[PDB]
Amino acid sequence: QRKWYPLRP
Amino acid sequence: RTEELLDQLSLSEWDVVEWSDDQAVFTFVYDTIQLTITFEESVVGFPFLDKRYRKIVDVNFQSLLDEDQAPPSSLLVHKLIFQYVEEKESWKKTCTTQHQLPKMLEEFSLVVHHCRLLGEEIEYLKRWGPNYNLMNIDINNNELRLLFSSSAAFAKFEITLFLSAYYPSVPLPSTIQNHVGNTSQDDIATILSKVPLENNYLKNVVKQIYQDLFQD
Ligand SMILES: [Cl-]
């Protein structure tokens, strides 16, 4: 669920 | 869901992403958690070394979650997971050679696995919570604030559940701030201790409250 688990840029 | 629940029995929480002479890297939770295992340096490749004797120089866990962009549930997941890593000190004293690495990845995967699912139950209660009369969910630092509200049952109260890394086997501690009606601590203690400490404890404890108190 990328929605819920975003990664730093 | 039924299909995967079967999947849960044999855990699959991580991806191997490097197996160097220098280090082994593993990710977790959609890759927002990164484990870097550093090995001692040698004059030979690791194919020539006995895993029972290949020394671990380092064990380094990292959260790569975007804390600005993440929702609270996901944030609580990282809070709890790493609270466990703290308790185990990154397994630095017990996971010292490559031989010992699978039993560590197991120990860690288990907690990653339940904490991630707790995240899931929260996002669920966040979408279907009304049907349970759960009008609001507030997460603040290991504390879960559930707000139940129904004019019709003439009850409104807030239950605070204290979560740990060890969910859901451990019996939750709670308190009730009462708004409307007279639900007591004993009434809550009761409802809680009738739900088994296994998956969906949160979901089931909410449904339990919605039957016992809002479906009379
Ligand atoms: Cl080499």
Cα–Cα distances (Å) from B129 to A6, B141, B164, B176, in that order, read: 24, 21, 22, 18
Which chain B residues are Cβ-neighbours of A8 within 8 angstroms? Answer: 64-66
Backbone angles phi, psi at B175, to 5 degrees: -145, 155
Q: How many residues does chain A have?
A: 9
Residue pair A4/B76 in contact (Cβ under 8 Å)? The answer is no
Q: Least CA distance to B122: which residue of chain A?
A: A4
DSSP one-letter code for B172: P
- The domain limits of chain B are 1-117, 118-216
Provide the edge-to-edge strand list for the sheet that holds B143-150. Answer: B134-140, B143-150, B155-162, B174-180
Cα Rg, chain A, nearest whole Å: 6
What is the β-pairing status of strands B134-140 and B56-63? unpaired
Strand B56-63 and strand B155-162: pairing? unpaired
Contact B58, B25 (CB under 8 A): no
Resolution in A: 2.8
Dist. CA B76–CA B122, nearest whole Å: 10
Cβ contacts below 8 Å, chain A against chain B, sum to 28
Give Cα B100 distance to the centre of its chain: 24
Tell me how many helices (H) and strands (E) chain A has.
0, 0
Nearest to A6 among B70, B119, B123 (CB): B70
CA angle B68, B72, B78 (to 5 degrees): 85
Dihedral Cα B74, B80, B83, B87, nearest 10 deg: -140
> What experiment produced this structure?
X-ray
Q: Give every CB contact of residue B9 below 8 A, 6+ residues apart in sequence.
A: none
Closest-CA distance, A7 to chain B, in angstroms, reads 5
Q: Which residue of A has its CA nearest to B78?
A: A5
Nearest-Å Rg of the Cα atoms of chain B is: 21
Q: Comparing C-alpha atoms, which of B132, B104, B150, B135 is closest to residue B200?
A: B132
Residue B186, φ and ψ in degrees, nearest 5:
-50, -35
